[PDB]
């Protein structure tokens, strides 16, 4: 019934009772576990009302005013609005709580210890791409804070029956262009070829570098997306150098300071916010290991290996591991040098272990996707590796949604 | 596409559908409500016969005589034997096929590309602890083959109706003693404290080293386990040295050449071989990262970092990652130097990807435990990290079984 959860380094055990609260099915079945899969393979009033009531219930419990008159009243309002219109609207205070909870509930996020400190920007009174742009710029400016990153989410208008969605076509507010060159090779970020091509097709004048910040393609309901170039001065970047390998800086690598996913759907009380970009700060391995070393990304491992006089002749010399480490070291040093918030995978995983403990005491468990929580390098050297985790869907939730094009 | 788990490789963008999972006749620990994929752990002649029939069909299918007279005759013979005795026996060739399929079916084994080359030693005539010892020594001699390791499995008599099980108490045929000290610390391998104390409780005169090879506690049916000291000349060990760090050899570290899980249960067609130790060869991270660096194992990370003069006071220096890499390198280098078979995590995972391809063609899929297949260090640097995997239980299988004490 309730999963027994063990930490194999400490021998300690817990029981996840929070999973019982899951109302949404994951991809697994007793026949086969698909936990390693990255993505999943006008709503009826009843369904919506139950999700809304549940969320409103979560909200009043949150302020320790459950059952109160304010609680009864609010539930009536939602009920009244759904019955008459088939949908309802959240009050800003609920939206704030809901966004924090979606973050707290994100199984793939290792930075959830920060969940309670989230600046929520209510952008639901946005009626045009132009306005979306203004709010996005404010988010970036607020969130960056001159390198002293602060967690934030900007919430745009909720989806509405039979009307197009507000959408940010970009997968992140800040991302580098990926230009396909004859050879089939890609200049810049291969993960962003399609979006780069969409921007171009929509009138963007493309650059030709390896780190060209993409412009935003913002879409107001049922309108073609519009292009907006982010003011370069709002986009903080960090040049990468190594603390002892002088030649590192010569690779001309750099990365943006602000990780800001912008293609996920924020679901709260049955309401869907198709555009709700959020940002916290980077864990170094995201940049040092995945962005820079994934073979299908910048794939710089070999280059750094060679620059290190490593024997890339054989895998047994562990040249890849060695290069990967210095790259990650480079990222950390650089961000620390540029005084831009960044957390290493050890500090991060240790704080996530504390978060697991906080959540165990607070809610009796914590949904966590082990494959995502365990860092991409030095997995077992971090505490989360030895920690069993239970993965399930709690709502409020951030979820994937189809690309708008 | 089709109606089976859609499996994607995110590095190559390639897709496959697992149809093999349809053959799974045993539930795993996951449900639509939650994924427990990261958990280390989780006779009615009627139930046996169905498993036995299934296995005989598997066997006859493998020799392409499915539906043949021999096939129907064996099926009838098995039902008859089970009918009059409650159990049945496998023909030699069936045992060989079964042991190989069990390995082939092992979701946690990254070395499955070698599944077809398993040397199956039939020890089903073994009738005493002393003889188990002889069989085990023969396995070790044959498997070690002076360093040019050969995968092998020695199958002792299957579990019998009322009779006691043949059991090897040790978790592996070769493991180091773990001596609980007065100050609570452990000298040797903390993972082996219990078995070490069990060997003492059974008359073993304990050594006092950090690498004392444990004796074997072998148990023939309904008899207390007997203690057998492996002749040192049969236990090949590899003193650890680093290719460049000359002081590493001074740490006096060493590991044994033959990894030989000896406490797993080999299940074939419902028959249970409680003693069927198997061995292949090591993937270097098993020793270098887990055995030597797990905080709950030899925990030598800090010692090596101090020797490397790293800043162990801060996580951001990545001292753990740095030392871990060197330790793993020392392991690969030493085994290669000592001419003892070993495979690094890069070679093993690439070979496993080939295996996935082979199996996709041969069986329409391959059960794999992602958390276990992806190596403990440099996870995303290997191809399996970017490979979605479907985990399910097929039979024949190797299963954990309770410790006999
Ligand atoms: C404050 C510091 C934060 C850090 C250190 C952090 C770190 C991480 C990391 C390492 C991942 C995995 C990223 C990947 O591999 O693609 C992740 C994923 C995620 N985080 Fe956080 N996070 C933070 C803030 C936030 C905030 C503020 C939100 C939302 C309000 C959030 C929501 C999520 C979600 C939904 C995922 C999954 C994203 C996906 O599936 O692509 N995170 N986070
Ligand atoms: C030929 C060389 C082989 C290599 C390189 C290899 C490598 C591995 C590795 C790295 C693991 C994970 C070990 C751990 O993390 O504890 C493993 C697990 C396993 N291997 Fe293989 N293996 C090989 C041979 C074999 C053979 C001959 C068999 C059986 C006939 C086998 C059966 C298994 C099983 C059942 C597991 C899971 C054990 C457990 O749950 O503790 N392997 N193997
Ligand atoms: N630190 C993060 N990280 C999440 C965004 C950065 C991440 N490294 C990234 O590039 N995400 C992409 C690529 N993989 C995700 C996916 N689902 O495919 C989206 N978030 N935050 O708010 O502080
Ligand atoms: N390469 C192996 N590896 C499996 C045995 C060595 C492995 N590194 C080990 O120490 N396994 C122990 C500790 N963890 C496993 C468990 N289930 O707890 C058993 N086997 N082989 O036959 O070639
Ligand atoms: C196939 C596998 O699920 C996939 O590569 C996952 C593994 N773990 C991950 N972990 C994090 N943090 N981010 C990712 O993108 C992934 N990708
Ligand atoms: C909790 C988690 O399942 C556990 O630490 C697993 C992770 N992956 C592993 N992978 C391998 N190969 N071996 C192990 O012992 C483990 N331990
Ligand atoms: Zn699962």
* CATH at B319: 3.90.1230.10
- Per-residue exposure over A264-279, b if at least 16 CB sit within 10 Å of its own CB, e if not: bbbbbbbbbbbbbbbb
B386 in any annotated domain: no
After which residues does chain B break, using C–N > 2.5 Å? 42
- A101 in a domain, yes or no? yes
* Least Cα separation, residue B145 to chain A (angstroms): 22
Q: CA A392, CA B6: separation in Å to the nearest integer?
A: 20
Q: Residue B196's closest CA among B168, B169, B221, B177?
A: B177
Site of tokens 């507010």: A173
Residues of A acting as catalytic residues: 109, 112, 281, 286
Whether the CA torsion B277, B281, B283, B286 is positive or negative: it is: positive
My answer on whether A226 and A287 are in the same domain is no
- Produce one character per residue of B282-319: b if its CB has 16 or more CB atoms within 10 Å, e if not: bbbbbbbbbbbbbeebbebbebbbebbebebeebbbbb
Show the beta-strand stretches assigned E in A189-290. 216-219, 226-228, 237-239, 254-256, 265-268, 271-273, 278-279, 282-283
Instruction: With respect to residue A174, please indicate whether it lies within any of the assigned structural domains.
Output: yes
Instruction: List the alpha helices (DSSP H) in A129-288.
Output: 129-144, 193-201, 284-285
Residues contacting residue B304 through CB under 8 Å, at least 6 positions apart: B248, B251, B323, B326, B327
Is the residue at A379 inside a domain? Answer: no
Q: Is A343 in the pocket of ligand 1 (CB under 6 A)?
A: yes
Closest Cα to residue B343, out of B141, B145, B111? B111
State whether B231 and B129 are in the same domain. Answer: yes
Residue with tokens 């002892």: A244
In contact, B11 and B386? CB cutoff 8 Å? yes
Nearest ligand 2 atom to alpha carbon B375:
10
Q: Can you say how many angstroms the Cα of residue B60 is from the centroid of all Cα atoms in its chain?
A: 27
My answer on whether A207 and A294 are in the same domain is no
> Tokens in use for A156?
């745009």
| Helix pair A45-62, A69-85: axis angle to 10 deg | 160
Q: How far apart are CA A262 and CA A276, in angstroms?
A: 6
> 């002649």: which residue's tokens?
B45
Domain containing B76 equals 18-124+151-161+265-279+349-373
Encode B74-98: b = buried (16+ Cβ within 10 Å), e = exposed: bbeebbeebeeeebbebeeebbbbb
DSSP reduced 3-state for B185: coil
- Chain B residues in contact with A5 by the CB 8 A cut-off are 39
Flag if A370 and B318 touch (Cβ within 8 Å): no
- CB distance B156 to B166 below 8 Å: yes
Considering every ligand atom, which ligand is closest to the CA of A36? Answer: 5
Pair B175, B145 in one domain: yes
What is the C-alpha to C-alpha distance for residues A119 and A151, in angstroms, rounded to an integer? Answer: 6
- What CATH number has the domain bearing residue B207? 3.90.440.10
Data resolution in angstroms = 2.1
- Residue A125's contacts (CB-CB under 8 Å, 6 or more residues apart) are none
Interacting residues of B25 by C-beta distance below 8 A, sequence separation 6+: B51, B54, B394, B395
Q: Taking a C-beta distance cutoff of 8 angstroms, is the pair A80, A119 a contact?
A: no
Same domain, A212 and A321: no
Which residue has its alpha carbon closest to ligand 4 atom 9?
A: B286
d(CA B80, CA A297): 61
What is the domain count for chain B? Answer: 3
Distance (Å, rounded) from C-alpha A72 to C-alpha A308?
66
- By residue count, chain A amounts to 405
Domain shared by B157 and B48, yes or no: yes
Cβ <8 Å between A296 and B10: yes
Tally of residues, chain B: 405
Domain of A104, CATH number, reads: 3.90.340.10
CB contact under 8 A, B301 and A381: yes
Q: Taking phi first (over 0 means left), then psi (-120 to 50 degrees means alpha), and beta for anything else, what does residue A299 get? A: left
* Domain membership flag for residue A334: yes
Contact B97, B59 (CB under 8 A): yes
Asked if B321 contacts A378 with a C-beta cutoff of 8 angstroms, the reply is: yes
Q: Is residue B2 part of a domain?
A: no
Closest to A377 in 3D by CA, of A340, A299, A322, A334: A322
Q: Tokens representing B35? A: 């994924």
Sign of the dihedral defined by the CA atoms of residues B201, B205, B208, B213, in that order: negative
Going A143 to A144 to A146 to A149, the CA torsion angle's sign is positive
- Distance between CA A199 and CA A179 in Å, rounded? 11
Helix (H) or strand (E) holding B270: none
Closest CA to A341 of A397, A294, A299, A280: A280
**Residue whose token pair is 């380094």:** A9
- A244 and A320 both lie in a single domain: yes
Tell whether A102 and A221 lie within a shared domain. no
Residues B210 and B227 in one domain: yes
State if residue B282 touches ligand 4 by the CB under 6 angstroms criterion. Answer: yes
Q: Does ligand 1 lie within 6 Å of residue A191's CB atom?
A: no
Pair (A93, A219) in one structural domain = no
> Do residues A383 and A9 lie in contact, with contact meaning Cβ atoms separated by under 8 Å?
yes
Closest residue in B to A335 (Cα–Cα)? B316
The CA radius of gyration of chain B, in Å to the nearest whole number, is 22
Query: How were these coordinates obtained?
Result: X-ray
Is the same domain home to A248 and A156?
no
For residue A307, what are the contacts with CB-CB under 8 A and spacing of at least 6? A245, A247, A248, A251
> How many CA atoms, within 13 angstroms, populate the side-chain half-sphere of residue B257?
28
**Is residue B11 a part of any domain in this protein?**
no
Same domain, A40 and A111: yes
Helix, strand, coil percent values for chain B (each to nearest 5) = 40, 15, 45
Q: Is residue B138 part of a domain?
A: yes
User: Which residues are bridge partners to A217 per DSSP?
Assistant: A227
């Amino acid at each position: 019934k309730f999963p027994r959860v063990k930490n194999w380094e400490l021998g300690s055990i817990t029981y996840d009772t929070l999973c019982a609260q899951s109302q949404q099915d994951g991809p697994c079945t007793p026949r086969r576990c698909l936990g390693s899969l990255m993505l999943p393979r006008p709503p009826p009033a009843e369904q919506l009302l139950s999700q809304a009531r549940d969320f409103i219930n979560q909200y009043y419990s949150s302020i320790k005013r459950s059952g109160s008159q304010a609680h009864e009243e609010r539930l009536q309002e939602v009920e009244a609005e759904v019955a008459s219109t088939g949908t309802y609207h959240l009050r800003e205070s609920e939206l704030v709580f809901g966004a924090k909870q979606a973050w707290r509930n994100a199984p793939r996020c290792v930075g959830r210890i920060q969940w309670g400190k989230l600046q929520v920007f209510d952008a639901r009174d946005c009626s045009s791409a132009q306005e979306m742009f203004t709010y996005i710029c404010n988010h970036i400016k607020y969130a960056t804070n001159r390198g002293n990153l602060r967690s934030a989410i900007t919430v745009f208008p909720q989806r509405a029956p039979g009307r197009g969605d507000f959408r940010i076509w970009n997968s992140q507010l800040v991302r580098y262009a990926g230009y396909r060159q004859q050879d089939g090779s890609v200049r810049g970020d291969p993960a962003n070829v399609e979006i780069t091509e969409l921007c171009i097709q929509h009138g963007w004048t493309p650059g030709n570098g390896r780190f060209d910040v993409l412009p935003l393609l913002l879409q107001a309901p049922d309108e073609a997306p519009e292009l907006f170039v982010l003011p370069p001065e709002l986009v903080l970047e960090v040049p990468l150098e190594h603390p002892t390998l002088e030649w590192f800086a010569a690779l001309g690598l750099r990365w943006y300071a602000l990780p800001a996913v912008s293609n996920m759907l924020l679901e709260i009380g049955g309401l869907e916010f198709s555009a709700a970009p959020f940002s916290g700060w980077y864990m170094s391995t995201e940049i040092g290991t995945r962005d820079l070393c994934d073979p299908h990304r910048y794939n710089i491992l070999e280059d750094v290996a060679v620059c290190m006089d490593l024997d890339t002749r054989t895998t047994s010399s562990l040249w890849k591991d060695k290069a990967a480490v210095e790259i990650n070291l480079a990222v950390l040093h650089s961000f620390q040098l540029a005084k831009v918030t960044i957390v290493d995978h050890h500090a991060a995983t240790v704080s996530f272990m504390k978060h697991l403990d906080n959540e165990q005491k607070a809610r009796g468990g914590c949904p966590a996707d082990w494959a995502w929580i365990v860092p991409p390098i030095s997995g077992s050297l971090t505490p989360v590796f030895h920690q069993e985790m239970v993965n399930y869907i709690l709502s409020p939730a951030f979820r994937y949604q189809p690309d708008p094009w």
